[PDB]
Amino acid sequence: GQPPSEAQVRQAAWIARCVGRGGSAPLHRDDVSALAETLQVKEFAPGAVVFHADQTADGVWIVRHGLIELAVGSRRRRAVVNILHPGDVDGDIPLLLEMPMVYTGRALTQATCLFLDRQAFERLLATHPAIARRWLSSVAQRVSTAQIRLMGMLGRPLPAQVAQLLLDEAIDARIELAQRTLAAMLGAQRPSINKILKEFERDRLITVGYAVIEITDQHGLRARAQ
Amino acid sequence: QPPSEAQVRQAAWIARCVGRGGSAPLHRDDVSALAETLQVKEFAPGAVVFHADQTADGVWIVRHGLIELAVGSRRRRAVVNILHPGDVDGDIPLLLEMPMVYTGRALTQATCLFLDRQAFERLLATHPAIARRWLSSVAQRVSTAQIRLMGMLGRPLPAQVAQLLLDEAIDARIELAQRTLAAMLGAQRPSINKILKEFERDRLITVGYAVIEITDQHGLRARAQ
Ligand SMILES: [Cl-]
């Protein structure tokens, strides 16, 4: 079929940069344990949908086991914008903003997610001050981190921006994003991005693979990021 | 000697996360109830309320007067925002354990209320409605800025300028230096100056000394695309 619009990809990608991670998790795993019988335990076969784009955020999802792919568009030509690992959290900030989810989460491997519905979420915050307080820290961290990344791109040459984006996205020196998605995140023309990546590759800074990019010279790439 | 473009840009976008009105974490009734908790600070014009690069050690609520937010040496200051009664600042850097990134100076006689770190934690620990409202407030304030930044991506500069003027306008008025407008867009003053003069020739805006008035909102929205 057809790929989603540049606008849809850009919006999904940057909003997906506010997901909760290890260092920014709103609940400790021990808090999660204590919520047993309140959290709903959901199992997912590979390929199964956890939540749908454009549907109201009606609770908080915690990844417990497996990997969850975040993507926008039709399955065949969807744009992957992120991957959630065990401990990661999504749904809470859009709930706080009374917004729908703007991408779809699907199990990439056999997965278990824990669901805190809206009512349970409100009750938790109304009754547990320490949990409310850590949630506030988490939200501040996650949204500010995204903002600061957008701010930092401004006023810099595009190759510096691409270099910086790769460095920021890399996990174990790997960026698992399509070139099209990188272009969308930077508001850049796709041929412009291709040429930069090709130059970085020629200069032995990166390797461009099958919708993944490998960093081969971190210090050299840091220099391009200025 | 002046602040750098990156300094101005950073301070300006951070200043766009100030809590105001519906987005403020404390409403007027909360502030009244916190009378014997909040420290009342009085200022004369030119007084420094808080300094760039200093540790955020509490939350500021403006009660009376106007507070100019700016970066750079005093003589070469770039103004990035004005706080008005009801505005709340300092809470996000406090939550992040980060420094203030701009200096607040009183423009007028001013009264600010200060909720120090210890009082802030005690409030959050004992007031569930204010704790829950703070959560939504931080999310809303920063996301609103995030959305403005996202919406600039890949757009032509004249549309960005038109959109920024529309977003900044209070009662059709924008009080920022052209160099600051340019820094917020990641651009240089001559580029912005050329665009504003063309907008002014088409009777969309009127341009003064660090002040722009919108005179044709429909026309300017058209340019914002
Ligand atoms: Cl491409």
Side-chain angles (χ1 to χ4, degrees):
Chain A
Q2 246 35 67
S5 77
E6 180 187 15
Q8 275 179 305
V9 176
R10 166 167 51 258
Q11 183 201 32
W14 278 112
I15 287 164
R17 295 316 180 265
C18 296
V19 296
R21 312 287 208 177
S24 62
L27 294 157
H28 189 263
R29 65 173 290 169
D30 286 341
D31 298 315
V32 178
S33 299
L35 283 164
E37 295 167 13
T38 295
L39 291 163
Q40 306 170 232
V41 181
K42 310 285 206 164
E43 312 292 348
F44 301 88
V49 173
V50 181
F51 50 79
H52 282 286
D54 300 326
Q55 290 203 355
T56 309
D58 51 17
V60 181
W61 289 97
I62 307 161
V63 185
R64 177 60 186 92
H65 295 295
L67 304 189
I68 309 306
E69 174 199 87
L70 306 187
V72 61
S74 73
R75 277 193 75 98
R76 180 71 61 80
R77 293 205 64 154
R78 68 186 188 275
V80 168
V81 293
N82 226 336
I83 297 294
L84 303 180
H85 292 250
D88 293 352
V89 173
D90 203 350
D92 53 333
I93 292 178
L95 188 170
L96 292 165
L97 301 171
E98 313 280 347
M99 293 299 290
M101 311 297 300
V102 299
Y103 42 71
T104 293
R106 284 172 189 97
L108 207 59
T109 63
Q110 187 71 37
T112 306
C113 299
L114 310 174
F115 182 67
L116 190 70
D117 63 30
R118 169 197 303 278
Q119 187 179 14
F121 180 58
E122 292 302 336
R123 194 188 188 274
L124 185 62
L125 295 178
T127 53
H128 293 63
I131 288 176
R133 177 63 181 83
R134 169 178 182 135
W135 222 300
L136 178 56
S137 277
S138 171
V139 167
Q141 182 171 341
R142 288 147 63 185
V143 299
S144 299
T145 294
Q147 183 201 357
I148 285 150
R149 292 184 55 180
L150 279 165
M151 284 178 19
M153 308 275 75
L154 285 176
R156 291 161 61 190
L158 191 52
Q161 295 185 49
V162 174
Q164 188 65 62
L165 180 57
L166 295 175
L167 289 168
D168 286 350
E169 296 292 325
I171 304 290
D172 291 311
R174 301 178 62 88
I175 298 86
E176 297 198 350
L177 298 167
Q179 295 175 46
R180 191 167 183 166
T181 299
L182 300 172
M185 294 179 77
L186 295 178
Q189 296 284 81
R190 289 170 66 189
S192 297
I193 293 304
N194 188 63
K195 175 183 203 268
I196 290 164
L197 289 176
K198 278 189 66 161
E199 287 172 328
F200 283 175
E201 187 167 27
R202 195 184 62 252
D203 296 343
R204 293 205 207 97
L205 300 187
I206 70 182
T207 291
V208 177
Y210 200 54
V212 56
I213 288 166
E214 190 169 327
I215 295 174
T216 59
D217 183 13
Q218 218 207 4
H219 267 22
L221 190 60
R222 273 274 159 207
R224 306 309 193 90
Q226 300 175 356
Chain B
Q1 304 152 333
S4 66
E5 295 173 22
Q7 275 181 273
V8 174
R9 164 168 50 255
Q10 170 185 60
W13 279 109
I14 288 311
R16 294 316 182 271
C17 301
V18 158
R20 170 176 304 171
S23 87
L26 299 163
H27 295 152
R28 202 178 322 280
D29 284 345
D30 303 313
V31 173
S32 304
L34 291 170
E36 300 180 334
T37 297
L38 290 166
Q39 298 168 231
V40 180
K41 312 290 199 191
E42 308 282 2
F43 303 99
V48 177
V49 180
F50 51 78
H51 283 279
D53 301 330
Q54 295 220 2
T55 294
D57 43 21
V59 181
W60 293 93
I61 305 110
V62 185
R63 176 107 275 271
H64 302 289
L66 299 190
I67 305 301
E68 173 204 90
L69 310 181
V71 282
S73 76
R74 191 189 170 264
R75 325 166 191 170
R76 305 285 196 186
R77 266 163 29 233
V79 174
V80 298
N81 216 345
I82 303 311
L83 303 178
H84 295 257
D87 291 352
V88 179
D89 201 4
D91 54 320
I92 297 171
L94 179 71
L95 284 167
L96 297 169
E97 312 254 345
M98 301 204 315
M100 301 301 286
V101 295
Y102 40 71
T103 294
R105 295 178 177 84
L107 243 22
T108 63
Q109 292 182 37
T111 304
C112 292
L113 312 165
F114 182 66
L115 183 76
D116 69 16
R117 179 192 310 276
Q118 173 165 213
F120 173 69
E121 297 291 350
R122 185 164 299 107
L123 184 57
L124 292 178
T126 57
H127 201 299
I130 280 167
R132 173 67 181 82
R133 175 160 65 256
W134 224 296
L135 194 51
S136 276
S137 165
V138 172
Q140 197 64 71
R141 286 149 65 189
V142 185
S143 64
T144 287
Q146 187 191 5
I147 290 159
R148 290 175 58 183
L149 289 159
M150 290 172 37
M152 282 155 52
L153 291 178
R155 307 219 308 134
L157 189 55
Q160 291 192 60
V161 174
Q163 184 62 237
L164 178 61
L165 293 181
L166 293 163
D167 289 342
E168 291 293 320
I170 302 312
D171 295 325
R173 191 178 177 94
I174 300 92
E175 295 174 355
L176 296 168
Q178 297 185 30
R179 182 174 178 269
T180 302
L181 293 180
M184 290 183 72
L185 299 180
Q188 308 275 5
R189 194 188 185 279
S191 283
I192 262 50
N193 179 257
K194 183 173 189 295
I195 287 168
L196 296 177
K197 296 217 249 185
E198 189 260 348
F199 288 172
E200 191 169 30
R201 279 183 208 112
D202 290 329
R203 293 185 209 82
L204 303 183
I205 61 169
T206 289
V207 183
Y209 296 123
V211 48
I212 293 159
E213 293 215 339
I214 296 169
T215 57
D216 180 6
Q217 191 186 39
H218 183 75
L220 193 58
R221 272 165 177 173
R223 311 301 274 263
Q225 296 183 5

